Amino acid sequence: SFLKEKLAEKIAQHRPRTTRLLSEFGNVKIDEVTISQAIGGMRGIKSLVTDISYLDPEEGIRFRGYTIPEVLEKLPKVPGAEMPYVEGHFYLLLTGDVPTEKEVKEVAEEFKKRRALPEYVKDTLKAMPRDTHPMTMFAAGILAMQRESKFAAYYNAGKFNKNTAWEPMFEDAMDLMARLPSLGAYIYRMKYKSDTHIPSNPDLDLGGDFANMMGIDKPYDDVARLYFILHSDHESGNVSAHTAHLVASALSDAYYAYSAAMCGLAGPLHGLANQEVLKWIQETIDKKLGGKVPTKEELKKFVEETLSSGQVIPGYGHAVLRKTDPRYVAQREFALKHMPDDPIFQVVSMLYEVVPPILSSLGKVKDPWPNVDAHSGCIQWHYGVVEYDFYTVLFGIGRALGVLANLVWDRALGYAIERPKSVTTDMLEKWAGIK
Amino acid sequence: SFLKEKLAEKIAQHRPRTTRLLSEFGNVKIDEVTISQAIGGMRGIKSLVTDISYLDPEEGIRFRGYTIPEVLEKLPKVPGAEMPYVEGHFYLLLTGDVPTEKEVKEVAEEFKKRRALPEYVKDTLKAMPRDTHPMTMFAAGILAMQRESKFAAYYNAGKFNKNTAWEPMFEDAMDLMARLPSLGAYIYRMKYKSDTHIPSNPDLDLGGDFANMMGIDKPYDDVARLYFILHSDHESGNVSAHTAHLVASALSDAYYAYSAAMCGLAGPLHGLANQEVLKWIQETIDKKLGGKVPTKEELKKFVEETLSSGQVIPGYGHAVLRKTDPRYVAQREFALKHMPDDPIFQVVSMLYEVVPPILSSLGKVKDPWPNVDAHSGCIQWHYGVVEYDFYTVLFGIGRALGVLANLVWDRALGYAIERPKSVTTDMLEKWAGIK
Amino acid sequence: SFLKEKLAEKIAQHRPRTTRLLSEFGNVKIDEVTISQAIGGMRGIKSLVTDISYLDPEEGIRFRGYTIPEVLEKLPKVPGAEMPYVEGHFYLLLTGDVPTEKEVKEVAEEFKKRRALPEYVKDTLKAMPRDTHPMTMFAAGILAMQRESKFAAYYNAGKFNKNTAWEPMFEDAMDLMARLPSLGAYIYRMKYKSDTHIPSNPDLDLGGDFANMMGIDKPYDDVARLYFILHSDHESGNVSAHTAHLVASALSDAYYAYSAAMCGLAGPLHGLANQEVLKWIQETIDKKLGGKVPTKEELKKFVEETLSSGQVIPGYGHAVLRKTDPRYVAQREFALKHMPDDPIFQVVSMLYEVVPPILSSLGKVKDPWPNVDAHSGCIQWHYGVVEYDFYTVLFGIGRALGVLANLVWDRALGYAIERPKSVTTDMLEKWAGI
Ligand SMILES: O=C([O-])CC(=O)C(=O)O
């Protein structure tokens, strides 16, 4: 039972559905476009297809039909530790199936042999000024390893075949996913930990070895495992996942595609929310609460003034999520058990109480509820990841699991180039009756 | 006169129009989306807004409402050369106005002072293996300079505001546009010309200095002014312009945005058609045509043999264009004028006569006509730019002209994060009634 | 056809709206259900949805937003005649758009080629005893023709698709509507006019050909076009429209649905009032007015005798109307023009004046006002349609317009099987506290 073989089977079962949908039901209508939506970032238009994950606006994110709680129970657990192998979650995103112990082990052995970082990636990151933002460094590392692309080599030797193209894409995906934790770790060490490095430990799994290379003791190994599974995918319309998909649709390899994707995740409106919550809180705990865990009342009215004055409670909104986020939920369950007393956690817990009441009552706030990055930071800070800018790197490692899975499938199914049609301000004006 | 102040003026007049389309005419339907389109990468969906350029299927591209012939006619010319200052085209894309001679001079002077490459860019490209692909190097060079982003510093200093965000965007666009030719030339010299560098001549325009730094004599300066102007923009739905737009919509700076864009342009379905066309012609001449420019009738039968056996004619057709590309036309006039007796151009000319009737009869191709990529290669090769992989880097340099103008406007008008909605196969199958 | 794709166009726009209400606001309360209403036939419960027409208690019926005056006014008229093509009304009911002259003409051509009666319908009707009530013959004729159902043929060959199911429903609607007047007219000749049959004239409009085949001269053509439009629909909760809806909600075809429709319309409390009115007027005229148009006074006193004897003035009252029926209004307009001097009409007219005041001030009848069943009879009798039982067949042909339009949408919008919940008397007694 091997991943690539099983993946071939699933691809063989899935192709006729796609073919059918095109041949028999091509012109069936699924949505409309308004002036509002064209000007406003295609907001809400159903115009992309993925099966890796689906984001219900009411129910949370599902990974291959499963729920977060389901995924966390079903995936084989790392022995002597509490969370699943991340490699098992990748097996699941790739195939649709929960892996057995036996199947996880095989992927994890595969990751161990693909995990080493090319020495020239380090050369490049050293030549880039050390004051460069970690996400720029992370994107660069990815880009430089485009030299190693099996998909690019396949294409340039003239081997392109629409049926087999997924095979080198799968190879590139396994290689890149194996290496991202090492690349992130290297960036962490070189910028923030005095440029001393802890070697990869061949016996550890992906998340375990990330914790190791980061230089953080148990239970950070589980913090990482959980964090990456949680950030693994949020369907394909988020900017990072979409950016990867889009670039890849031109048959650019994954190195190009995921580098481009990290350029999107770097954006303040996409990858910064975890840290901005945490800085908001700390500052609140500082100025507005005399350096101390407050009480329910105090917090209740703190919100109201911040609201009344044209300010937003951070990490309590979202463009697609309309209910509470179950990624948020899994973080808590972890916090409640591992750091119940941590001062910062106590404030994110209490915030859970009041702020839904106030936005529900104030009105509007189409999403009057917490998204994941309302929680992620307090866990990181607890364990001594204080370097805020780096948080987005952790996001990038995680999000690759679903995006690279997605890229394999884009190629398996021959999804065509993404090339919408532009219109001018004048054209919109016509269609609106203006003159 | 001054570019920044005129740009301000144009923004302050445009902003109410967008406002109005949103405020009054928001839910006006402009298009619909079918199952075919979700699966077929959004083909045809009118879901993006730009005023920089507009791609008309029949007429091709208009830059700020001007046709290619009237752009080349109206833009101020470099003294002692045939072609316009690329800096003038840039002014036109930013403002909508055709600049006076005085107005281009001050854009040329501004670029002269923003032209120099950060030394660490050269350090970075040297650390990257020398056998790395030139587009990988080009993307990397761009990305490394994200360190200088005024937009990023502005955001990180807490200065973000929807009225002023265009300003540091413009500064970053000006900085980066000024340097892109030097970045490309550095890559050309370091890879292909023995790693000897020709210094910038502070007395040349962008086009002339690019030929200087490449080490190519007149009239390659004109080849470059024309090439870059023709490749400047193809509205915003093309993968590279779209990638930059999408990434910048999360408030990622132009460096992140344009590095991402070049990752998409790297793609064989986006940035390779030039070299692939040229290789095809040269191979065809060698094997099928006994190393000689054929007669009309000999080439008509080679085309049909090729079309009958399951092949395609490279550089013909397009996902949007439905008639002859006016970019192809402008390249032809240059070729006719400058290299009539060139063997490769001859085949290109004859192809232009022979191929459209044959493709039209068969009605396989929806655009049975050439695009620019049918023509660019023979001109490059004629002046001794024989390094096929580098052709795309020339594209990158040109395309930044419209894409960076576009990011400035995106920020001016406050266009929101791009976040369309994904649906699964199961969901398409439900909508199709095959639940 | 231009009709079929105009309709495809409306459906594709209207479906997201329906999904939205389901998907987002599906738990929003719309009304409540009291023991009274459960016992008394769902009286006043807002449990059905339709867009073909809406019945306002006060203003009465609107067809696709439009009132009766407006509909009569806007619909293309027949050359040489007063009234609209009924085809025109069908288009409007289907599409929602008032039709151009060309649009009306395309429906009329479509009906002219769909108009011919299967010979086995005639065989079946001849085998039914000639003394069978015309509504039974009517419902049987419809039912027999479910052999031709395209919608059924499409179900049986595995081709059902929730997106495409409206399309064969539409074909059947067009096939059946095109035939209903011919079926009606065959029943009329075979029973009442010596079993001799005037052929269909393929140059005539639906209503003109009906009168042609019935054997009645102008202006019976206009009587019919008017009659059919006015009876076209009365939203979906009336027993005939509801029966068809209910039956088709189980994905029975329109032949099954409308046959069932006509079984309900057959009922004394739904399709008989027109005739029961006209008889009672005839009686009264003969055995209470010395066979002559009374004075206003003579008749104001007659209404009270009858009432205070525990009798009802038929053709007045309604379970939903609460003011005067605009259907009644329109019939009256026609009468005043064409038959002012008719004795029976003159009593209908007088009645119009004296009955509401009495009924109002008695405070008993919740609709102290006429409905259309108060008027239709005098018109039919005036032109020599004396055969009382057959009136309800006229209603059937009429009411198909709106109901078959409605079934196309039911399938278009994919409405589920109508299946409410039953409760015992005991349970009602428990929710009463006994
Ligand atoms: O609406 C009702 O319940 C009865 C009626 O008047 C009609 O069917 O036209």
Using alpha carbons, select from B153, B259, B139 the residue that is nearest to residue A263.
B259
Catalytic residue among B89, B373, B375, B410: B373
Chain A residues with CB-CB distance to B317 below 8 A = none
Mark yes or no for CB contact B418/A239 under 8 Å: yes
Q: Which of C48, C40, C372, C88 is closest to C235 using CA atoms?
A: C48
Residue C384 contacts residue C216 (beta carbons within 8 Å): yes
**Could you identify the residue written with the tokens 């979202």?**
A318
Rounded CA separation B412/B435 (Å): 45
Tokens of C38: 């459960």
Q: CA-CA distance, A330 to A386, in Å (whole number)?
A: 21
Rounded to the nearest whole angstrom, what is the distance from the C-alpha of residue A379 to the centroid of ligand 1? 68
Inform me whether the C-beta atom of residue A28 falls under 8 Å from chain C C-beta atoms.
yes
CA separation for the pair A410, A412 (Å, rounded): 6
Residue among C168, C130, B432 nearest A29 (CA):
B432
Please state at what angle helix C296-307 crosses helix C343-362, rounded to 10 degrees. Answer: 50
Nearest Cα to A281, choosing from A302, A254, A250, A267?
Answer: A302
Instruction: Say if residue C219 is preceded by a cis peptide, omega within 30 of 0.
Output: yes
DSSP C200: P
Amino acid at the residue C134:
P
Do the Cβ atoms of C377 and C383 come closer than 8 Å? no
From the centroid of its chain, how far is CA A262? 10
Atom of ligand 1 nearest to the CA of C265: 8
d(CA C410, CA C432): 37
- The sign one gets for the Cα dihedral B259, B265, B268, B272 is negative
How far does residue C350's CA lie from ligand 1's centre (Å)?
24
Best residue of C160, C163, C164, C167 to probe chain B, by most B CBs closer than 10 Å: C163
Q: How far from each other are the two terminal CA atoms of chain C, in whole angstroms?
A: 62
**Ligand 1 centroid – CA C139 distance (Å):** 19
Measured between alpha carbons, how far is C422 from C33 in angstroms, rounded to an integer? 13
Reply yes or no on whether B373 is catalytic: yes
Provide the pairing of β-strand B60-63 with B66-67. antiparallel
Q: Which of B231, B242, B245, B318 is catalytic?
A: B318
- Among this protein's residues, is B318 annotated catalytic? yes
d(CA A301, CA A288): 11
Please say whether the beta carbons of B228 and B395 come within 8 A. Answer: no
Residue C161, chain B, CB below 8 Å: the answer is: yes
| A93-97: long-range pairs with CB below 8 Å, 24+ | A93/A52, A93/A53, A93/A63, A93/A64, A93/A232, A93/A233, A93/A401, A93/A402, A93/A405, A94/A3, A94/A7, A94/A170, A94/A405, A94/A408, A95/A3, A95/A6, A95/A7, A95/A10, A96/A10, A96/A51, A96/A64, A96/A65, A97/A6
CA distance C211 to C219: 9
Is A290 at the interface with chain B, CB within 8 A?
no
Q: Which residue has the tokens 């030394």?
A: B119
> Residue C238: CB within 6 Å of ligand 1?
yes
- C163: distance to nearest CA of chain B, Å? 6
Query: Could you count the other beta carbons within 10 Å of the beta carbon of residue C180?
Result: 25
> Which DSSP symbol is given to B97?
S
Strands A421-423 and B46-49: parallel
| C12 contacts on A by Cβ (under 8 Å) | 29
- Beta-strand (E) ranges in C37-172? 53-56, 60-63
B30 Cβ under 8 Å from any chain C Cβ: no
Encoding tokens for residue B414?
A: 């406050």
Alpha carbons C330 and B380: distance in angstroms, whole number: 83
- Give catalytic residue positions of C: 270, 318, 373
Q: Assess contact for C55 and C235: CB atoms under 8 A.
A: yes
The single residue listed with the structure tokens 């107005």 is B103
How far is Cα B350 from Cα A337, in angstroms, rounded to an integer?
A: 76
Token pair of C416 as six digits: 């589920």
